Subunit: 430 residues, 3 copies
């Protein structure tokens, strides 16, 4: 028999609608190379891989209880008792030695208490493997995001460097106009403030670059992970621009997070089955089988055979209210596993909805960012010539140089924000 209830999956509390391989997804040959390195060597994932080895050993520990064992023991008992207590009526020293095999307390499994406990340890083992899958998904997504940011930094640094040489050469022209006398002093300072902006932004971009590089070196986790990353990155898109979201129902059966959570609920359901079997009578066997003697010299002799066999049944009648508390505790734990499962679904529903809302917005933004960057860069060139001729003051040209630079960086930003939100979608689906 087994008192564990029948497991029914709780109805997905999310709405029915929203408003596949990692190598297949990650097209870039080097990024995929990097993810393979990280997947092989990342130490946080390695801990989660050894978590499942522990969880397997716990099931193996519980499985051991279902089978009866066999132990070779030797037990001497020597004691001086009073005259008063013994049948002899004169105070005596009694000795008794035993050797041979013995059966440690073995539970007959009529109500499936141990069966149920062994089942729970399986479900947490399986929930550990689903957690290791979730971490694997999370690692690949984190390695990619860190490569996209590293790339995005290098695009900013390259832009800033071409912006710096432009403003440095453009400043040299304004300096010698004042040395002549033709240049305003305000114009000279406004051109200087431009050059320093570029130097300060280059420092910011060098920081972002190397902090992204270090984060990558960590996530790879090799001693040679600094060598493995290319200093000059391939500028082609690294991932599939479009992914179909699918039904939320498919997500529930697909995503490791969900599978880890349902398996926890199954373990908790098995736990109920153990609480129920405690109310029912426990039966157990103890056994000893070997050779008993009165002296050390009489144990390796003929006809010294001896055995003990002890079956015992026991049924709790009165507790302090313990078994019903154990039942109430296992049920509360189960109800939490259900709420956990429901909440884990609802979360995953929100994480993909966010990734879709982002991806829809970011495709539509990046077109506005490019066209503004082109509108700014042409307005820069018109305003350049308007100052350079001498029609308008330096301010318009100055303001256009700021706007050009801001808009061109803000594009590099929103392009990288589009590709990262794409991998966030691949993670959130699973």
């Amino acid at each position: 028999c087994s008192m564990a209830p029948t497991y029914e999956r709780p109805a997905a509390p999310v709405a029915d609608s929203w408003s596949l391989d990692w190598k297949s997804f990650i097209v870039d040959a080097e990024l995929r190379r990097l993810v393979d390195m990280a997947l092989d060597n990342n130490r946080s994932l390695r801990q989660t891989l050894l978590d499942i080895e522990a969880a397997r050993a716990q099931y193996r520990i519980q499985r051991a209880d279902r089978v009866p064992g066999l132990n070779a023991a030797a037990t001497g008992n020597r004691q001086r008792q009073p005259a008063d207590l013994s049948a002899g009526n004169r105070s005596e020293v009694a000795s008794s030695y035993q050797v041979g095999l013995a059966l440690p307390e073995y539970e007959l499994d009529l109500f499936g208490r141990v069966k149920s406990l062994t089942d729970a340890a399986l479900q947490q083992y399986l929930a550990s493997e689903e957690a290791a899958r979730a971490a694997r998904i999370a690692l690949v997504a984190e390695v990619s995001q860190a490569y996209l940011s590293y790339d995005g930094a290098l695009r900013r640094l390259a832009l800033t460097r071409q912006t710096l040489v432009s403003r440095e050469y453009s400043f040299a022209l304004i300096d010698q106009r004042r040395a002549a006398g033709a240049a305003t002093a305000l114009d000279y300072q406004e051109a200087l403030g431009l050059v320093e902006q570029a130097r300060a932004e280059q420092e910011r971009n060098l920081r972002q670059k190397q902090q992204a590089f270090n984060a990558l070196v960590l996530l790879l986790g090799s001693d040679d992970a600094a060598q493995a990353i290319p200093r000059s990155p391939g500028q082609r898109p690294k991932l599939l621009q479009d992914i179909a979201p699918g039904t939320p129902s498919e997500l529930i059966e697909r995503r490791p997070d969900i599978l880890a959570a349902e398996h926890r609920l199954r373990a908790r359901n098995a736990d109920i089955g153990a609480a129920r079997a405690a109310f029912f009578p426990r039966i157990s066997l103890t056994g000893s089988f070997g050779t008993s003697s009165a002296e050390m010299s009489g144990l390796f002799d003929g006809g010294s055979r001896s055995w003990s066999f002890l079956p015992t049944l026991t049924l709790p009648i009165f507790d302090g209210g313990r078994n019903r508390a154990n039942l109430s505790l296992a049920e509360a734990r189960k109800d939490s596993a259900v709420a956990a499962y429901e909440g884990t679904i609802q979360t995953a529903f929100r994480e993909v909805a966010d990734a879709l809302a982002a991806s829809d917005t970011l495709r539509r933004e990046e077109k506005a960012l490019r066209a503004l960057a082109n509108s700014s860069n042409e307005a820069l060139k018109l305003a350049k010539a308007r100052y350079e001729s001498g029609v308008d003051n330096h301010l318009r040209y100055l303001d256009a140089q700021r706007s050009s630079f801001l808009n061109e960086i803000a594009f590099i930003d929103g392009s990288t924000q589009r590709q990262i939100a794409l991998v966030d979608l691949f993670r959130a689906l699973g």
Copy 2:
């Protein structure tokens, strides 16, 4: 005879009052917005994080009942058989004897008589942990009331910014069409068209930003509500700005000590450790263990229920340790160290509550003044843009004044929404911090 120390509440390590510029009110009294109350009620009834915290109250009660069950004697029905081959030298018969012994009846598992208050201490400890969980749930409740209000205002802000960004986009494209017709004729220069073009392209990108924000804020607000019926519950119209009471009197910190759940839970977790000392104390003293059986027994099975076959056993056992390996002392050291850690915790949560209320107080009077400044700033920019258009229509001034005046009128109007939003979120933070 409970050996737990007499519990005195640790003195509060915070200021006797709050620095710079009624708190008996209900959260429904605090939240004037009837829509927001409906959303928060739905969150209260359906959220899963709160559900999980309420359910480990249920766990904590059961754990108390398992310790409370240890206090009272129990009774098992039992049936035990024993068979054994005893050899001649140990046996009374002087020949190899096989003896069986089947017995059946009621039995008493090892019962500890609580003279020294050991088990009562453990039971008081488990009770206190249950009362802590009760307060931990009252906290989780308040946390979620705040999180819903913060999420709903953040969402209300995101659509209110979207609403200005689209109206600005329309007037943006309309003013570009006028410069497009002027440039098509050949009067207006290539730059005045290009500057108006880029600026329309910029306002396109900002609308997308605000769209994503409201969608992400919608999603986060849906999860909080945690219901299948959630998307229907949320308004797409922005409610009237006074969604909560603007004026609250925080009172002293000493009033906060008795009100705020986090603290009261931490106090109960302290009381739990005072008890645990009483258990470690009592373990030094003797332990009186009682077992007993009662019913029938025999050598053969058929004569179990037989006349004059009554067989019982009554075993009291007393044990007191002279020496171990300093374990009982090591166990009292542990319990005293954990008591102290609970005092530090209790005090550490009060200090933390202090910071939180103090931040909320500072934020709320700075954002009041900042809001007035930002509203006045945006209005000067808005009228400065009116005057920059007059200068452009007259032709007396360049496009660049008219460009700066609409960038800065747009940024200042965005910043005012952010500033108005941030203030009322701080009133929620002040409600959250006071408990």
Copy 3:
């Protein structure tokens, strides 16, 4: 005789250098006398530190508990047993009600660890408390750093406030000139609105700076964790730089030996190497012995009497031929757990490398960024004076003056932010490095 394998330090999983502290302690590192006083104050009365210190005294106790199991105990005891039995079961062949009593010293359940399982469990608990020490060293260094940062943020906010107020008063004077000119008809209504805008920007900025100051203050009060901490925080900026600007990082091989995080993990690893020795010891047989000494009698009166002296002595040996695969599974679990601790030890060093790396990169780039930001600041301030003269002549429209005022104020804030952020990066570097040699022995006070 402990059968656990010989402990060997895992080779460092990162390169031998950083692409381009022993002597330095926190009191040497922090130059400002006022900040030193703040750090001292938090170290005494910080409650999160206090908790991690009491976690050591708890871990010591649990080491003392496992030690206890290693030596034999002895205890006094009084055992009564009254029992009825029928004739068919009694050896006397009659309705017998026999009683017995015992009083005296009992030795319970002592285990001779010939194969050494209990010593290994004692080693595990020893290392756990040695990790608990290192853990609190980290938490203390982290406290130093956190108070330092919170003060540096506090300092910075007072500077932004000072500027904002200076800026603000200039804007109030400038506007009063234009309010008069627009009253006279000498300035345009658009110039008057722009000037009013400038005033409000700085007014709103004042309020932002005040919150920033007060929240950083409230954080400091918390970290100090004292009733009288608020009085101990300086109300005015520290005149000069408050830390040493140039810290030499040393190798990563040195960081392994110094940094608390790494050593905490190392002790935990060594604790799991012991738990393997305990699982290996489970395969060999368990020798348990029990004994008694005292007086026993049939009736309660006869207890303490001549010829009542009774003793008990029973040693058991227990070897399992079959388990259920449990002793194998325990060993597999002990190997798994040890392997996770080794990976944790590696991951800690790797994570320390990233934090150090990020911190030097931050320090060096912010050095140069600050110089550039200083150069940009006073460029925009000189151009402010020129644009002011150019506007006041009537030569230019207001926009050039207005834009210079905006740019100067925004660049001067940006310098304060950048400068304070460099100092916060110097603190982040100190933490990531993890202090000099054996920075703290506040931990071992018992």
